[PDB]
Paper text:
A prominent therapeutic target for antileishmanial drug development is leishmanial GDP-mannose pyrophosphorylase (GDP-MP or GMPP, EC 2.7.7.13), an enzyme catalyzing the formation of GDP-mannose by condensation of mannose-1-phosphate (Man-1-P) and GTP. As GDP-mannose serves as a central precursor for biosynthesis of diverse glycoconjugates necessary for host–parasite recognition and is essential for parasite survival, disruption of Leishmania GDP-MP activity leads to complete loss of virulence, suggesting this enzyme as an attractive target for development of new drugs against leishmaniasis. LdGDP-MP exhibits a hexameric structure with a molecular weight of ~245.3 kDa, consistent with previous observations. Each subunit is made of two separate domains, a N-terminal Rossmann-like fold commonly observed in nucleotidyltransferases and many other nucleotide-binding proteins, and a C-terminal left-handed β-helix domain containing tandem repeats of a [I/L/V]-G-X(4) hexapeptide motif, a characteristic structure found in the transferase hexapeptide repeat family.
We next solved the structure of LdGDP-MP in the absence of any cofactor or substrate at the resolution of 3.4 Å using single-particle cryo-EM imaging technique, which comprises of six subunits and exhibits a D3 symmetry with a dimension of ~104 Å × ~104 Å × ~108 Å. The homoheximeric LdGDP-MP complex is organized as a dimer of trimers, with each subunit pinched by two neighboring subunits via two interacting regions, namely, interface-1 and interface-2. In interface-1, the two subunits are attached in a shape-complementary manner between the region around the canonical signature motif GGXGXR(L)XPLX5PK of pyrophosphorylases (PPases)8 in one protomer and the C-terminus of another protomer; whereas interface-2 formation is mediated exclusively by the two C-terminal domains crossed at ~70 degrees. The contact surfaces for interface-1 and interface-2 amount to ~590 Å2 and ~750 Å2, respectively; and the interactions are established predominantly by hydrophobic interactions together with a few hydrogen bonds. Strikingly, replacement of R23 with alanine (R23A) caused loss of ~77% activity, whereas the mutations of P364N365 to arginines (PN), deletion of the last three residues on the C-terminus (ΔIIM), their combination (PN&ΔIIM), or deletion of the entire C-terminal domain (C-del) rendered the enzyme completely inactive, indicating the essential role of interprotomer communication in attaining leishmanial GDP-MP activity. On the other hand, disruption of the interface-1 contacts led to instability of the quaternary organization, as evidenced by drastic changes in the oligomerization status.
Author numbering:
A (entry chain B), B (entry chain D): 191 to 196, 201 to 250, 256 to 379
């Protein structure tokens, strides 16, 4: 600690000038989670590193509310209900009290907090809001982030579109964009 | 029968000229099934007229292979297997030996002869081939006709595209067109 009014970061050039700066090589993964794409990539790199950390034949989480199959490792919150014939894809996370329909596909996607999901939808490489209420037969794929308390009708196809909070969606979007 | 070498609509002007032509007014439906769109419209007008004709609380066909729900009247071939949680939409037809997945949406669509359908797909206002083999989580909607012995991979979205026989589809199509 030295009083340096505005500042070469932490005075690193001088730190090397007196030659007391050391480096520690890391064998593990490293990436900056600053974007939704980087968010998904960090999740898919970080999930396998938690095998010895937390509680969760692929037995990361297999029988919660019914006989469903998980292709790869995933984080299933114990209070959640998965359904009867869902297929939780590789490297997926699900929050507390989340409800997943009778048959679903959660592929490399994150479901946060209290969310309801219908029957037959596919959530691929995407994120959903906190109190999100998702339709039954929709199709959400690519890097699309859904804000808080959004709702989508049945049979909508959001492909890489970010929606703002409290909005409502009822129409297809086949191109990247933003919904206000 | 009179020998008229070539043509005037079987000589209807003269037929009326001798004044021996009668007409019968029809109270029922009538339309020319010459296009897939007209095919779908004729099906949706003709299905309700068969309530007293053939064998098939909405009890047109309710329990075949599992406890599934039918929203409206539909024609389910007895040899078919519907699944466990399918939702056969209004005015749909299914051919013999057809297999429908655990949860499906057959909405105003026709399935012809031996076809297999995965889990969670949606077939809306469309037709499928004879020996068609449909993927699991696909999404086929709008007026799209699939030829004979076509196959679609998982998670494809065909929106109003007509595919030729024996072809294979593995990529999305968000616009009307033809696949060779």
């Amino acid at each position: 600690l030295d009083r340096i009014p505005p500042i070469e970061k932490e005075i690193f050039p001088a730190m090397a000038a007196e030659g007391q700066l050391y480096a520690f090589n890391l064998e593990g993964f490293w990436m900056d989670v600053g974007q939704p794409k980087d968010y998904i990539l960090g999740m898919t790199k970080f999930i396998p590193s938690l095998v010895h950390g937390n509680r969760e034949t692929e037995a990361v989480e297999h029988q919660r509310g019914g006989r469903f199959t998980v292709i790869g490792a995933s984080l299933i919150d114990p209070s959640a209900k998965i359904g009867d014939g869902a297929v939780i894809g590789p490297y997926a996370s699900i929050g507390a009290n989340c409800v997943i329909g009778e048959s679903c596909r959660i592929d490399n996607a994150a479901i946060l907090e209290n969310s309801k999901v219908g029957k037959g939808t596919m959530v691929s490489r995407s994120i959903v809001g906190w109190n999100n209420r998702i339709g039954s037969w929709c199709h959400i794929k690519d890097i699309s982030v859904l804000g808080d308390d959004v709702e989508v009708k049945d049979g909508v196809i959001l492909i890489g579109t970010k929606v703002l909070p409290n909005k409502d969606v009822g129409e297809h979007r086949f191109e990247p964009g933003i919904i206000m």
